[PDB]
Each structure stands twice: as C-alpha cells, then as structure tokens.
Design a protein around this ligand. Sequence first.
Ligand code: E0S
Length: 600
Amino acid sequence: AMQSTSNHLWLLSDILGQNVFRGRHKKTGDLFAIKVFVQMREFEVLKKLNHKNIVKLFAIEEETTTRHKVLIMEFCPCGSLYTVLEEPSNAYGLPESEFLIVLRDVVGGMNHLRENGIVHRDIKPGNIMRVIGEDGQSVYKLTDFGTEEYLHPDMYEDLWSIGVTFYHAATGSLPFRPFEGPRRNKEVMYKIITGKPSGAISGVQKAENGPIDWSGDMPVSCSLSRGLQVLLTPVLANILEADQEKCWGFDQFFAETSDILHRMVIHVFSLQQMTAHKIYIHSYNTATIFHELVYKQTKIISSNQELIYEGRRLVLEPGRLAQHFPKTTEENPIFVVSREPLNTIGLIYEKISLPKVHPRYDLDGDASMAKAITGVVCYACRIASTLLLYQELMRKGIRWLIELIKDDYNETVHKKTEVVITLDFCIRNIEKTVKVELGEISDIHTKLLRLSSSQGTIETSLQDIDSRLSPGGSLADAWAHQEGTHPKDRNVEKLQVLLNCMTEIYYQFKKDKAERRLAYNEEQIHKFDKQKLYYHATKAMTHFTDECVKKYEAFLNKSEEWIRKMLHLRKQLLSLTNQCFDIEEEVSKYQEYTNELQET
Ligand SMILES: CC(C)c1ccc2oc3nc(N)c(C(=O)Nc4nnn[nH]4)cc3c(=O)c2c1
C-alpha cells in the first residue's frame, strides 16, 4: 500500500517530515521529496527559484487516488540542521568550518529571497536542510517558506530566529532556556525575552522559579575560536532586542556577516601561554592590523611579537598583505613569542561531570539522558584531542625555539671572531712599533688588555650558554617528550571507542523512543545496554581525568618552569651580544687613532 502519481511514487513507511514522503520517479529511479497536502501562480513562480541555498521546487503534480496537489521537490538524504544538532558531536556547538558553511548558506539564501521578496520569519534548524555537494562539504538550503522557541517578543503574543539559530548552532543549546524548559515555564520564556538586556544574548534559569543568569559572551563550552566569538558576539547582540529603534536590519546584517565571511584565517599559537588562536583578518589588511588582532587576543605587545614558522624566524613587514602570508593549518601555525615574561595559562574549558543515571524505565527519559551524557563524552573527547594537540604544538615550538637561540648564538660567534681578529691585529701591530710619548702607548695597552679581558669573560659566558644549549644542559627539550601524553598512547581513539559504543546505544534508544512500547526481550536489552552506557561513560571519564588531565597538567607546570629558564637565557644572550657590539665600536675608536699618526 503506497501512493502514486503520473511520474512519481512513494511508500507511506518512508515518511520524512510530518506530509513529505521519500519518493522516486517512475521513469528514472532518482529519489525526490514528495509533498502531499491562486496556488497555480505562487507555485509556478517558485519553480524558477534557483539558488545553491534554496531547495529547488522541481514540479507540481496531482495525486492519483485523492487528486491532491503534490509538490515534487529536491531530496536531501542528510536531513535538516536540527538533525545535525541532535548528534552528540554537536551537543556543545557545531565545528567551526561547519558553522561558517551554515552562516554562508543562510546569508546567501536569505539575500536571494530578499532580492525576490519572500519573507521567511519562521527560520529554525528545522527549516534548513543539509545536502552533500560534489566536493564533500555540506550545502544548506531553505525550503518551507513561527516556532514556539524562535519567535519575536512582539510576534510571541525577521532577524530574530536567525540569531537564535546561530546561537543554537554555535553553542549547542538555546539562548533563552527556563528551568523546566519552554513548556509549563512558557510564561517565564516571555518574561525572559521582555527583559531585553540589550547586549546580552544568553539567559539561563538554573532553578525553578529562580533568577535568570544573563550573559553577553558565548559559553566556555562553545567550540568556536575566541576570535570568531569576538566577531560573532555583536552580530547576535544587535539583532536580539525588541526595539525596532535598535535593530540592525538586513542591510547592516548582510554587511557585517559579509565582512566576517571575507576574512581569511591565520593560525597563531602562543607558545609562552600555551594557547592556540585563530586570527580572522581580511586578505587585504596589512601585517600591522594582524599584530593588532594578535594583541587583542593575547595581550602581547605588537613590537614584542617575535614569530616563528617551519623552524625559522618570520619577519612580517608592516605593509605585507595578509593573503601573502604563508598558509597555516591548526597543526602548522605561526608561533608567537615575546621578550616580556608571560603567564602560563594553558587551555580553558568547561569542566562538566557525569549526570547521574535514573533507574526508571522511560523511553523518553532514557533518550534525553543518553543524548546529554553522550554529548558530555563528546566534549571530553574534543578537549582530550585539543590537549594532545597543544602538547604536540608545544613540543614542535620548543624544539624550534632552541634551534633559533642556537642560531643567534652562532651569529654572536661570528661577531666575536670579528672582534678577536681586530683585537689581535691591533694589539700586536702596536707592539710592532713599541719594539723600535710613552703614555700615549701605555694607556693604549692598559685599555686593550681590558678589552681582551672583558672579551674573554664574554667567551666564557658564551661557552656556558653553548653548554646550556647542549643535550641535558639544564635547558634540553627532552622532558617534553617524557612528560605529557603522546599520539603513541592513542588516548583520543581510546576515548572514541567508548564514544562509538555510547553513540550506538544512544541511537538505539532514539529508535526505541519512536516505538511507544517494546516487547519483553527488547525491554531487557534496552535496560542492559542502559547500564552498559553508564559503565562506558564511567570508564571513559576515569581514563580521561586520571591519564589525559594529569599528564597535561604535569607537562603544563614543567613548561611553566622551562619558560622562566628560557627567558632568563634569552636575556643573558642578548646582554652578551650587546656587550659584543658596543666593544666592536670601542675597538674602532683605537684602530684608527694611534695606528695612523700624522707626518709628511
Ligand atoms: C530522519 C532523517 C534521517 C532524514 C533523512 C533524509 C531526509 O530527506 C529530506 N529531504 C527533503 N528534501 C526534505 C524537505 O525538503 N523538507 C522538509 N521535510 N520535513 N521538514 N522539511 C526533508 C527531508 C527529511 O526530513 C529527511 C530526514
């Protein structure tokens, strides 16, 4: 039993959205999204609507048995944005690149709809479908053109649900949540929106009939980079208040969003702070503004920013455009160091624990619980891989920094030889004439011998530093390989195994919730795997805090000491080379003084 048309057919079991059925064409076999329910104009005008971010309405037919108006639309095997947000890997926010894709498609689609003049208003993650492009990345489209959670305070009685959708995608949770959720606390919801704190974007009621925790910045669990949060906070803040006097409008919205989308990414890893950062800078900006953003994200003075890339010093000309910078990834960034002592902070993340498991056999409660806990383990896996990444970037940055310091030492050796050759060829060229009026030479020797003495002290204090830049010389990078975690331990994948187990159990509970009840056998399987879920999560957190976190903190403290040692050595070597330059010119005051007398 199924429904058919002149060109398409569909089964009622393959139901998509509740109606829209997953159908096929009678002559080609290609799958289509079949929609089964003045019109003949407003639909044919929707036929011509062609865009990358718009679900192409293919045709309009009439069903066989009921003669209903059936819409032949494009099929999207992946689902909607809401389906993507239901996965545990996005329970605390989408990945950064995926978020940029969502923003680009949403803006690029709504701009086309405004060029054609179609207001959507009800724009939720359920109205944004996701397909797979020919390149592999996702492509999001609009289709159905409000919802109880995405309504405007005045409509609750256009740029609002867009902001709520962007916050939901960036943080994994809704911006305005009462205690018992937007259900019986619905009035609180209204009181939360009419509280319009202007700039703030978040308000969480963490107690029944309690207060509302307001916030203007994104939560710590947000997986976006700090720079992307800096550029994203005002865009949401200015489109989330009931005042039409203080609303941006689509012109300012599209302008600022287009400003964000046109910025290339520069990966910069603060080594002395052990903190990774992404600088969003246009391709036409100069390196001065780049140092400005690096300062605004790391508090490092622009003139003190010394950059390292691929094992070499990197000098950025203040006028060099950003698009001509070397291409950098998350695993091959541009290390920034400074001569000023910097505090060793490390990674900042939200420390979440395991929510307790309930014994009540509840097909809905076990589903929501499994979703929450699996999202927690996903966050623990993300932070685990991020800590491993910070440790490896730390090892590469240190192993490069020691070689850079040794290069500076080698240049100091060059200048030292330049001073020694002149010192000898000027202290003995005078003794050539002495062995043939006495104060003019005695003073010279009493100064040149001082020069050779202090120069010798520089030699000893230099060979001491070369002894410090040797293996095991109270400055070797050997402890970094023998402290924190490594990809050899395979901790990220060790957590990802239990993550796949808990994800399979979660999906099976998602299938068990659709069924209103289970048989006895399937019930006992549901309970057994419900306990195995708790065992998997407990083992995962045990392996996370008692192996990844401890090693990371040991490596971090050790790094905090080695940073002090390295800064000390850098100041010493700088002082020594400076004591090699000012005496390089002090021997220039004597090489031309008496060695060249005046006589016809
Ligand atoms: C249940 C999930 C796995 C899934 C898989 C494929 C899907 O494939 C779709 N392909 C479309 N073209 C539209 C659509 O155009 N509009 C629409 N339906 N419901 N809400 N919006 C919707 C869907 C789905 O739901 C869907 C879900």
